[PDB]
Amino acid sequence: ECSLKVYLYCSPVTKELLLTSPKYRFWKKRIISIEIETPTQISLVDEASGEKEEIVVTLLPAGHCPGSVMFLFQGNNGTVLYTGDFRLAQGEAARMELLH
Amino acid sequence: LIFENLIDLKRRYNFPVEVEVPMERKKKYIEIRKEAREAANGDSDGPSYMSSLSYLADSTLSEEMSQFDFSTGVQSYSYSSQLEMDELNRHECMAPLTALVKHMHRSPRDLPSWMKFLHGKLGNPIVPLNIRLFLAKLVINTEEVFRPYAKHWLSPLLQLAASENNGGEGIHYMVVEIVATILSWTGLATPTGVPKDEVLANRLLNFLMKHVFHPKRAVFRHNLEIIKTLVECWKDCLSIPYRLIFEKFSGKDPNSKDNSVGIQLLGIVMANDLPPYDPQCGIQSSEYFQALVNNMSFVRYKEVYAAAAEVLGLILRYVMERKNILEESLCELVAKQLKQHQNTMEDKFIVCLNKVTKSFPPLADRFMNAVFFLLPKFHGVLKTLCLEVVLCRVEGMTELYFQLKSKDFVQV
Amino acid sequence: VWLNCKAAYGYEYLFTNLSEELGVQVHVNKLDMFRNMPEILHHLTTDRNT
Numbered sequence: 001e002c003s004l005k006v007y008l009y010c011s012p013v014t015k016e017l018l019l020t021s022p023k024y025r026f027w028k029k030r031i032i033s034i035e036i037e038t039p040t041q042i043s044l045v046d047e048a049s050g051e052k053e054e055i056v057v058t059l060l061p062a063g064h065c066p067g068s069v070m071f072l073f074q075g076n077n078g079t080v081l082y083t084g085d086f087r088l089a090q091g092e093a094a095r096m097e098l099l100h
Numbered sequence: 101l102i103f104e105n106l107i108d109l110k111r112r113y114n115f116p117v118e119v120e121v122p123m124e125r126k127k128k129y130i131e132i133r134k135e136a137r138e139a140a141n142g143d144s145d146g147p148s149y150m151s152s153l154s155y156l157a158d159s160t161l162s163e164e165m166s167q168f169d170f171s172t173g174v175q176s177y178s179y180s181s182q183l184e185m186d187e188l189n190r191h192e193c194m195a196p197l198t199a200l201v202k203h204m205h206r207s208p209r210d211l212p213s214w215m216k217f218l219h220g221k222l223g224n225p226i227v228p229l230n231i232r233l234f235l236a237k238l239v240i241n242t243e244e245v246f247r248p249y250a251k252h253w254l255s256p257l258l259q260l261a262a263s264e265n266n267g268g269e270g271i272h273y274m275v276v277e278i279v280a281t282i283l284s285w286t287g288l289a290t291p292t293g294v295p296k297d298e299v300l301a302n303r304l305l306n307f308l309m310k311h312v313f314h315p316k317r318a319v320f321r322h323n324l325e326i327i328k329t330l331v332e333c334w335k336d337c338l339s340i341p342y343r344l345i346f347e348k349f350s351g352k353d354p355n356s357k358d359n360s361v362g363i364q365l366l367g368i369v370m371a372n373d374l375p376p377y378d379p380q381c382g383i384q385s386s387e388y389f390q391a392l393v394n395n396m397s398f399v400r401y402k403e404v405y406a407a408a409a410e411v412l413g414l415i416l417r418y419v420m421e422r423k424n425i426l427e428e429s430l431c432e433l434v435a436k437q438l439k440q441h442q443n444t445m446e447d448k449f450i451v452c453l454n455k456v457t458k459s460f461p462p463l464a465d466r467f468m469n470a471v472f473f474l475l476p477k478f479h480g481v482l483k484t485l486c487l488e489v490v491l492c493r494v495e496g497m498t499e500l501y502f503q504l505k506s507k508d509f510v511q512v
Numbered sequence: 513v514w515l516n517c518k519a520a521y522g523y524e525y526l527f528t529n530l531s532e533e534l535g536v537q538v539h540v541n542k543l544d545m546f547r548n549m550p551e552i553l554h555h556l557t558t559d560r561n562t
């Protein structure tokens with residue numbers, strides 16, 4: 001309630017599952033859902049100072065639960081990957097288009 | 101009468117929409133296009149469809165993993181939609197009739213007496229639906245013995261498919277089967293001579309594009325495939341229903357994917373070197389192309405704005421060679437829609453520009469400075485798209501090496 | 513048949529496939545969370561007579 005440029009990015013299914021709970025309905029105006037396999041640019045603008053920083057994030061399916069996705073960041077410090085609670089069978093890592 | 105006795109005439113023959121498409125169901129249309137493209141045209145240069153129309157035999161990894169995380173679970177569309185299939189093949193006299201026909205065949209050619217009887221019973225729209233369906237299944241199972249006479253059997257199957265009162269609702273397996281049979285028959289006979297066949301084919305195409313959508317991705321791709329091969333075979337006989345497509349890609353809803361169907365239909369139309377618009381419809385050129393270009397403002401789903409940008413670029417490339425007088429207005433609208441989000445989001449702008457300049461290079465000459473400004477600020481695939489936009493216009497640039505040196509091209 | 517599922521989400525695959533292969537609808541406490549997901553909502557029910 002004291003900021004305007006900070007948001008919560010997640011899958012659309014995750015947004016639907018999160019806004020249903022009454023305890024988390026205060027995030028209704030601060031959640032930005034992102035489609036999977038769609039490279040989008042995120043602005044890491046500072047609140048106090050007018051400094052800004054752009055980063056590219058890509059959401060990859062995880063196959064864990066409704067709304068579970070991965071996070072593939074690409075910026076100045078190289079490419080990092082966050083596979084939070086994923087599930088992949090053997091021989092499926094070679095089938096992800098966005099990781100190639 | 102002899103046929104109405106051995107048929108029920110009262111059983112509601114359930115025809116469900118085929119969901120689990122087999123592997124041969126794709127290669128049959130593949131070979132149909134292979135025959136209708138070279139055996140009857142002799143060109144061997146298949147139409148280059150857009151990225152959204154690129155097809156694979158199996159499904160992508162996201163489709164397979166969607167069974168667990170439901171990535172496509174959120175309802176985005178708004179269209180209203182709904183072996184126990186071959187019950188006609190499980191008829192008492194079905195196999196005996198097929199054996200009889202196969203035996204008697206081998207036991208400008210005109211139809212014999214039995215073929216005349218079959219044609220009189222099938223082509224007549226007053227004959228009950230069950231008898232016509234049985235005759236259609238018999239012709240399907242014995243298409244090899246009907247090919248030398250397929251010039252006569254083209255109209256009955258056409259008017260059976262184009263009929264509003266068919267077996268089931270939607271595009272069921274009987275429709276796709278008879279369509280595949282007719283398109284395999286297109287190598288020798290085409291609905292081009294008799295205007296009745298032309299209007300039958302037009303109504304069939306309208307019916308296909310009317311019920312092309314289906315929430316299941318596989319059957320939706322199959323319907324797009326059958327429409328694609330149908331418009332590829334009968335390219336010189338069909339009038340495209342531009343009014344239906346306009347209503348398809350004009351939804352004006354930022355959080356929906358309804359326009360994707362219309363954009364893909366327009367791309368299928370444009371890939372066969374067809375006009376993107378005909379003034380015969382009630383929609384003028386202004387609002388038509390306006391609603392078409394407005395899809396680039398829907399920056400939520402890529403299948404909407406990226407596909408719209410690509411199909412718009414194809415339309416620009418088409419109207420470029422034909423020297424039409426709407427090229428200036430279309431280019432102005434596209435440049436306006438691009439500059440609208442050039443500075444707001446600047447990440448969908450580069451994607452839309454790369455999709456447009458993929459087929460219409462001369463549009464990047466006004467955004468070259470913008471993409472050179474945005475190049476140092478991009479990462480990942482966005483920088484690659486910007487470099488591709490720079491690549492599409494290299495010979496036209498006066499002096500390029502200084503800009504690349506100033507933009508640290510070597511470390512890139 | 514009871515299904516002692518500890519996690520809140522992750523077992524919807526089992527529920528949907530059992531419903532599609534048996535025609536019966538699984539009973540859950542809350543299902544309003546899947547109101548915008550038709551492929552999952554039409555497999556769950558609040559009635560206890562299943």
Ligand SMILES: [Mg+2]
Nearest residue numbers: 064065084085
């Ligand atoms: Mg987990």
